[PDB]
Design a protein around this ligand. Structure first.
Ligand SMILES: Nc1[nH]nc2nccc(-c3ccccc3)c12
Ligand SMILES: Nc1[nH]nc2nccc(-c3ccccc3)c12
Ligand SMILES: [Ca+2]
Ligand SMILES: [Ca+2]
Ligand SMILES: [Ca+2]
Ligand SMILES: [Ca+2]
Lengths: 114, 114, 108, 108
């Protein structure tokens, strides 16, 4: 139910080995850790969660763009890229968060399917 | 060797049934038709060409964004989105042209693999 | 030293009357208020800070994109758009759609 | 009536000294030269045309992104970036990376 895909606009490639941390807002309004992983050789991250565990909530997907660029020996601008959204409010959906990265820029979109 | 993927930034969905026309620059510097198709329910267009037919050249991928929006009953800004590139100059590659559409904006990236 | 500019990819316009709050990260890893305002008719927010106030540090720009889309009658995906960067003249530009946003930095 | 603005997503800067040629589509479906210039230090190209010259029609903005990247020593993917639209004040903005570009229209 939750997938992340990341592309690199400088190299013309998937963005491989990008760390992604997902948080869920708790009852007390703090962010609680929900899941994490890293993108594969295709720039995709599957397996973050399950239909059972991906309940309604406000979720934050934090893509570690900084470490990605630094590993390439590049000094990037942003600390991270985050996507924060309310999930499953009108019933279960599947969410793909797609991101396109450059050292001084990022773009994200969501693909939501029923 | 050539795939096109299109997403819709307004609906949060694949951009389905988008016409895509591919041209190749001929010897006389004119654009010649090379291949065409339309995106599927996943927003993807496979099958445009083959390894045999996708020789070196300068290619134009013209994504019919205008008809896409008009079909949704929306009046868009651009006539189309085009990506023009030299292909296969240092040997065969696989190319994915990924696009993200809004009525007054588009973004494209290339994923090139060996 | 810091300018925010917001554009609307649906309407092909500046994103006007967008609330923007800027925070600086404190030593305890909490976020100190720093600047705020609403984008103008040109989608720009100028006058956030001065050179003497704007010291090196990690800054967060929180753009209230949800209220923007709802005031236009459009259901938005995101709760907000928050842009976090280290300062080491900065323009933070954002291009908004209901299910997507893009941001770039122009540092001159 | 027509302005072009170009930004560089790699360097976090305006894209300076970018050649831009504007064409208007003729009745025979060929392309008549209309305006051209190079982006300034702010990445902007102003003064392309006047109100009386800028009539309704289909316009093509051809941005020489390949020469831009090569002058910086960077191998680019695209031959150029060409933006085609009907005019029915227009800013055509483009954000460049070596393998990607994004463009939006701001019509006010
Ligand atoms: N997330 C993104 N922000 N900007 C983009 N520009 C082009 C493509 C993607 C994208 C990724 C995967 C498939 C299709 C599109 C973009
Ligand atoms: N043309 C564009 N494509 N993608 C973009 N992403 C962020 C910002 C801009 C942009 C440019 C000028 C002002 C405000 C926004 C972008
Ligand atoms: Ca509910
Ligand atoms: Ca060759
Ligand atoms: Ca320092
Ligand atoms: Ca008319």
């Amino acid at each position: 139910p939750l997938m992340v895909k990341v592309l690199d606009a400088v190299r013309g490639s998937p963005a491989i080995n990008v760390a992604v941390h997902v948080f869920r807002k708790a009852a007390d309004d703090t962010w609680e850790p929900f899941a994490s992983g890293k993108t594969s050789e295709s720039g995709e991250l599957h397996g973050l969660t399950t239909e059972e565990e991906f309940v309604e909530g406000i979720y934050k997907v934090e893509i570690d763009t900084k470490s990605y660029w630094k590993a390439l020996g590049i000094s990037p601008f942003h600390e991270h890229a985050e996507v924060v959204f309310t999930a499953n409010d009108s019933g279960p959906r599947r969410y793909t968060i797609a991101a396109l990265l450059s050292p001084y820029s990022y773009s994200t979109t969501a693909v939501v399917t029923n």
